[PDB]
């Protein structure tokens, strides 16, 4: 049915040794070369600890993984190996496991993040352009390697504001794109879920990540976190519909032959498109420009095939100051 409009054939060209994570053989490192110092975070899927690589006395992260499905371990490790050297992708340092339990751990680089709720309001207009551009380099890189992140959100984007460095982290939901594959629609955080996930459209692609980027960008320039605040998955679609409008939703549904679940009959009304300018306020207007609105408009589309590619997104006039400043060094 639907096929990605860029990078559709990447996994075809690279072959089984790139994407066949089921047959991954890990060359496990020495667990005793690492010392766990302090827990920094817990996920649904993991626990993250500040650690030391003892031989070099260097600071690093140990991410202990306990998913009920083992192939999710292999998938995360294969993608992290494949993205080696990628710009702004979190660096894999090692993979180790407990000798008795066989519980695996991923070792990554440590990043001194400032939490996004503190960090995002301190950004200038230029900072938003700059960090979105850096995030675009990581998404263009993984898409060009046949990989969808599927969990793009502020929590998975680590920024060292002092060093002006960015890392896209937590590749645990990431997956290889294979033309015509039916993917699980139970991916991403509710506020960052694309319409395709909300209406059970399974033939999605890299363009899912561009919707999620659009939700992050909206929250940064309008200072509303999260931008689409649904109380549940059905409500998430209503919140989107109350901004993009029900007219563009219905042609999209017709275009991809999607039938809405009967649950939407009572809760989904007819809404006109709310123009982007209505979200402009005294507090957020320092982020706002016609280039910014134009950029956001071209990310937040129902139709995944209408959204900018990460590569098109880097060519947008919004990033002209960032491209100019980079050209000065
Ligand atoms: O998943 C990864 O690849 C992943 C990779 C690197 C980090 C991480 C998650 N989580 C961090 N912190 C964090 C903060 C709150 C909750 C959770 Cl679970 C974790 C963190 C901190 C400093 N440097 C690197 C990381």
Author numbering: 5 to 333
Show me the paper's own sentences about this structure:
CK2 is a heterotetrameric enzyme comprised of two catalytic subunits (CK2α) and a central dimer of regulatory subunits (CK2β). Amongst these kinases, C. neoformans possess a single CK2α orthologue, Cka1, which is orthologous to both the Cka1 and Cka2 catalytic α-subunits found in S. cerevisiae. Furthermore, it was reported that disruption of CKA1 severely perturbs the production of two major virulence factors (melanin and capsule) and attenuates the pathogenicity of C. neoformans. The structures present a classic fold that is a characteristic feature of protein kinases, composing of an N-terminal region filled with several β-sheets and a critical αC helix, as well as a C-terminal region that consists primarily of α-helices.
To gain an insight into the binding affinity between cnCka1 and CX-4945 for the development of selective anti-fungal drugs, the near full-length structure of cnCka1 in complex with CX-4945 (excluding residues 1–4 and residues 334–338 which are not visible in the electron density map) was subsequently solved and refined to 2.09 Å. Similar to the AMPPNP-Mg2+ bound structure, CX-4945 binds at the hydrophobic catalytic cleft and interacts with the residues mostly through hydrophobic interactions. Additionally, hydrogen bonds are formed between Lys67 and CX-4945, as well as the backbones of Val115 and Asp174 with CX-4945, and an electrostatic interaction is formed between the backbone of Arg46 with the chloride atom of CX-4945. In general, due to the ring structures of the CX-4945 molecule, the inhibitor bound complex contains more hydrophobic interactions as compared to the AMPPNP-Mg2+ bound structure. In contrast, CX-4945 IC50 for cnCka1 was 77.44 µM, indicating that CX-4945 IC50 for hsCK2α was ~60,000-fold lower than that for cnCka1. However, in the cnCka1-CX-4945 structure, the corresponding residue His159 does not interact with CX-4945 as it adopts a position where it flips away from the inhibitor. On the other hand, in the human structure, Arg47 does not contribute to any protein-inhibitor interaction, while in cnCka1-CX-4945, the backbone of Arg46 interacts with the chlorine atom of the drug through an electrostatic interaction. In contrast, in the cnCka1-CX-4945 structure, the hydrophobic interaction between the corresponding Thr112 residue and the inhibitor is weaker due to the lack of ring structure in the residue. However, in the current study, we have observed that unlike hsCK2α, cnCka1 has a small residue (Thr112) at the “gatekeeper residue” position.
